Amino acid sequence: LTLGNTTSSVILTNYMDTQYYGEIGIGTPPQTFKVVFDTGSSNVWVPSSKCSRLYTACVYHKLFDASDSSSYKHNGTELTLRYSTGTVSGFLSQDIITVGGITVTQMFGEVTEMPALPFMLAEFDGVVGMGFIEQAIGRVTPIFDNIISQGVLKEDVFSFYYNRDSLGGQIVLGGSDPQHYEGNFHYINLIKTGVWQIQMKGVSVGSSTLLCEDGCLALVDTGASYISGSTSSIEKLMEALGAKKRLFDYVVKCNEGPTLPDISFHLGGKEYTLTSADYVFQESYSSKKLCTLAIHAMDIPPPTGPTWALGATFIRKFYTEFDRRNNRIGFALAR
Amino acid sequence: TTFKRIFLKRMPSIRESLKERGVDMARLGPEWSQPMKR
Numbered sequence: 412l413t414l415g416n417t418t419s420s421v422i423l424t425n426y427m428d429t430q431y432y433g434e435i436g437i438g439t440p441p442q443t444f445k446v447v448f449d450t451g452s453s454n455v456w457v458p459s460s461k462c463s464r465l466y467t468a469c470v471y472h473k474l475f476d477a478s479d480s481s482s483y484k485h486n487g488t489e490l491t492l493r494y495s496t497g498t499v500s501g502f503l504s505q506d507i508i509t510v511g512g513i514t515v516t517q518m519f520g521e522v523t524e525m526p527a528l529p530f531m532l533a534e535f536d537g538v539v540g541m542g543f544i545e546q547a548i549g550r551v552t553p554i555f556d557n558i559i560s561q562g563v564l565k566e567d568v569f570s571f572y573y574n575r576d577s578l579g580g581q582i583v584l585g586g587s588d589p590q591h592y593e594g595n596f597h598y599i600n601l602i603k604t605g606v607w608q609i610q611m612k613g614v615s616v617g618s619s620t621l622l623c624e625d626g627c628l629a630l631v632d633t634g635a636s637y638i639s640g641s642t643s644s645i646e647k648l649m650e651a652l653g654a655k656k657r658l659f660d661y662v663v664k665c666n667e668g669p670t671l672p673d674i675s676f677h678l679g680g681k682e683y684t685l686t687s688a689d690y691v692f693q694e695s696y697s698s699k700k701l702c703t704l705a706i707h708a709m710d711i712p713p714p715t716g717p718t719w720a721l722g723a724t725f726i727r728k729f730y731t732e733f734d735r736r737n738n739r740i741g742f743a744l745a746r
Numbered sequence: 747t748t749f750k751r752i753f754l755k756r757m758p759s760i761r762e763s764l765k766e767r768g769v770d771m772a773r774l775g776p777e778w779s780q781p782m783k784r
């Protein structure tokens with residue numbers, strides 16, 4: 412959302428490209444929802460039964476009806492996600508939320524305002540923010556902190572795994588599964604507490620280190636799917652890649668697709684390489700048809716930005732562990 | 747305690763749905779608008 416000023420006002424709320432949802436149960440009896448698990452936000456929100464604006468998009472989704480839950484306890488505090496036009500607005504509510512067996516008592520957003528567009532075409536109902544209280548609108552206790560206080564987890568950590576193909580993937584709560592990765596975990600300390608953002612010393616194309624020299628920041632957003640990074644950086648990277656802008660995405664000729672170089676992200680002193688097969692959608696091989704890379708622009712303003720953002724495609728190759736206890740992000744080669 | 751798992755199930759993305767419906771990307775409104783993502 413746009414709102415420069417604060418840390419809980421500049422949140423990458425992508426979802427344009429998001430192929431994976433999870434399920435939560437709110438209330439007594441539970442009311443289920445398809446939710447996007449985003450490490451970029453820290454708020455839990457679902458469409459509310461109290462949403463009524465004809466041009467909103469709540470109509471096309473599952474609504475939370477507080478009246479049908481015995482465990483419901485109201486708050487009423489207004490929360491707003493501001494965009495250029497228009498807004499994602501609602502009010503604060505408290506109820507019993509169940510995620511993968513774990514049951515908690517959560518302060519979530521009952522959304523009464525959703526934009527046009529893009530939400531009608533969203534197959535998911537709401538969002539579950541996996542970030543820290545520093546990014547939470549209204550400073551509300553995020554889902555993970557609430558799970559931590561239950562003392563159910565082995566470790567105060569969670570890890571994301573994106574499957575070989577397509578259930579499609581999974582979030583491991585309380586640790587990281589050894590059947591998901593090979594080798595050892597490389598632990599990178601966070602830049603600042605309150606955001607899943609790490610220091611990056613450089614980005615390489617081919618041989619050959621071109622951009623991100625003299626340092627740069629890199630977010631780890633699970634809600635995202637592509638690799639984000641400032642227009643100027645992506646303009647340099649794409650011109651070196653031999654790709655041209657086709658609007659919202661960058662393309663190459665499907666035949667020259669696998670012939671492309673390798674992108675390398677220097678994180679914590681280690682070489683995080685990404686081959687042509689990882690960042691290119693090879694649906695075709697014809698010299699006439701166009702293949703989407705993406706890797707797209709995305710300009711994030713301060714305090715959050717200027718920053719890069721490593722999405723679901725990075726986590727697909729690199730099994731990521733999110734350590735809330737030790738304030739670090741651990742990467743291991745996925746399998 | 748035993749390893750709690752959240753199973754991530756495959757869904758069609760907003761971009762994928764727009765392509766399937768044949769929605770012209772340029773006809774979504776001006777640069778300022780901004781088909782919600784940031």
Ligand SMILES: *[C@@H]1O[C@H](CO)[C@@H](O)[C@H](O)[C@H]1NC(C)=O
Pocket residue numbers: 485486487488550551
């Ligand atoms: C809502 O919760 C907040 C704590 O985050 C508190 O400051 C406020 O007084 C609460 N309001 C009601 C009506 O319960």
